[PDB]
Design a protein around this ligand. Sequence first.
Ligand SMILES: [Ca+2]
Length: 223
Amino acid sequence: IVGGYTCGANTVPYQVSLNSGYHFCGGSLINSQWVVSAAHCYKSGIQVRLGEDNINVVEGNEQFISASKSIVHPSYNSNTLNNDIMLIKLKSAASLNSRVASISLPTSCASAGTQCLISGWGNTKSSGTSYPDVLKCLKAPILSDSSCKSAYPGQITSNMFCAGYLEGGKDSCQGDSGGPVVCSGKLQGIVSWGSGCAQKNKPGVYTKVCNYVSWIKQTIASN
Ligand SMILES: [Ca+2]
């Protein structure tokens, strides 16, 4: 997260870190057994780390649970990033309390101008590289479809939206991938892609979660 703030420990209780020997992506806990992330975060051997603040220090609220199965969206295209969503099942159910909690799925799509909270352990610099240990947060608005398409000609599908600031300076970044965009207490986006980070006229692009609620629910019901 570039141009954000330190969230505070366990203030984003649905935020998970996906670990394969090291943090590599965010995700969002959506029930005791299941995490939503980006398909471009797929790999084998994932351990889901819930209750994290400092990802390099055991602070007392962690739950580390290996994934039993990952399901990339049936129509994910890794070239275009269309349908950049993946479900991860935990081998055991997480213990839920105020520091580790699921986030609700949307019942309706969000509109441009809605304010959201984007979070993660990704790079905090727009030029060069610095990875935080503690969770970072950014409040940002959803942008109009027309401004999103104008920013990224030929690239924005109906399964994507832009959020952030066209002036630059405030965005998600590498290592935030897969993590949440939460608006009015609902998971509306997944950190997906962008050109660099926090660049002028190049906002963040996010998977439009409201399009996937049917698929998420039916997948959970049978897996
Ligand atoms: Ca920790």
